[PDB]
Amino acid sequence: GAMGSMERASLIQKAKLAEQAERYEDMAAFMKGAVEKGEELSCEERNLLSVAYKNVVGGQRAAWRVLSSIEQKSNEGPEVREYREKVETELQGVCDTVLGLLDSHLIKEAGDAESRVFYLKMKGDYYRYLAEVATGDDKKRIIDSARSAYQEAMDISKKEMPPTNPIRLGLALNFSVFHYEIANSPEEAISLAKTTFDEAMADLHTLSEDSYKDSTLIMQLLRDNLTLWT
């Protein structure tokens, strides 16, 4: 790896700098290097990993959707399809890289609920991004891989975390989006969002002012989706 000669601490420091500079491809490369040092990641480090790849894949997904729409309109030369394929291939490569980091070896070394749920949610997320562009023989298996990762994360989070935990809430939010637009299960999506919102509501009284702000921020995303979906 091109980051093999840099100290772990310097990679983390430079990831934080790259975030401030909005250099998210650099940020992701630095955090990939940090993961490849082989040590477990702290809470803050896990968030840096997540933010970096979310921004990288988010730009690719937004581009793919623009190109796919143009391509669709043009089917109502080969250049549109070719360029959509180029972006799609690059996106799949990013998802494969993230999934490879989780499988080698973040998940197997993650014993605490906060770390294991975080990584299993990420695994579901990046299989979901693969499913957004999937069309061939393996699409159903891609979908089931996302479902399986989300489900294991949900099972742990329900046993080990309070209903206001922000990781638990963000997991439920994304699993509900999975149901709605990947699995064609809008009723499951709505039920999960509502149950998650209501159980978090009833737990807010246990929280500090800061935790309350953290949880209600994500609850608002659940509510906004319910308003869009109902």
Partner: peptide, 7 residues
């Protein structure tokens, strides 16, 4: 557009 956690 619906929200996911990262957004």
């Amino acid at each position: 557009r619906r929200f996911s956690a990262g957004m």
